[PDB]
Design a protein around this ligand. Structure first.
Ligand SMILES: *[C@@H]1O[C@H](CO)[C@@H](O)[C@H](O)[C@H]1NC(C)=O
Ligand SMILES: *[C@@H]1O[C@H](CO)[C@@H](O)[C@H](O)[C@H]1NC(C)=O
Lengths: 50, 27, 49
């Protein structure tokens, strides 16, 4: 939102919880798809050789 | 005439208004 | 000097503890996540430094 602006950041300091929601939701989605990629592939633990 | 360290000894009340049970940011 | 800080308060209106997120990466994490207790993990941080 703010291009390293002091006044813009000073006004966003009244919307801290909004960006806390956004960062937490996107981090949870990223961790969720790391879990998805782990669950679809990593089912067997012993990596058998060719 | 030497230096010491500000070991968290500069915290004051920024605004005159009353607040409780909150964590708020300041500039 | 001009600094961004994070201040907590109790039920009595007294200041419990301060962060001063211009000195430490953990302080910047505490100002970013809007909390004083942070769970274990990796978190992107803002530009308070
Ligand atoms: C404080 O330390 C700096 C370097 O660490 C030094 O240049 C300065 O003279 C010191 N301050 C005083 C009042 O001696
Ligand atoms: C607030 O003050 C009362 C004294 O009347 C004390 O018993 C209580 O522990 C204080 N609360 C905090 C959070 O320090």
């Amino acid at each position: 939102i703010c291009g390293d602006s002091q006044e813009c950041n000073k006004l966003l300091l009244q919307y801290g919880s909004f960006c806390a929601q956004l960062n937490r939701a996107l981090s949870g989605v990223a961790v969720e798809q790391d879990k998805n990629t782990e669950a679809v592939f990593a089912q067997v633990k012993q990596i058998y050789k060719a | 005439k030497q230096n010491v360290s500000s070991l968290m000894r500069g915290v004051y009340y920024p605004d005159d208004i009353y607040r409780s049970n909150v964590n708020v940011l300041f500039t | 000097k001009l600094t961004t800080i994070m201040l907590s308060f109790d039920v009595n209106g007294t200041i419990d503890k301060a962060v001063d997120c211009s000195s430490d990466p953990l302080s910047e994490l505490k100002c970013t996540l809007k909390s004083f207790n942070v769970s274990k993990g990796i978190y992107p941080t803002s530009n308070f430094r």
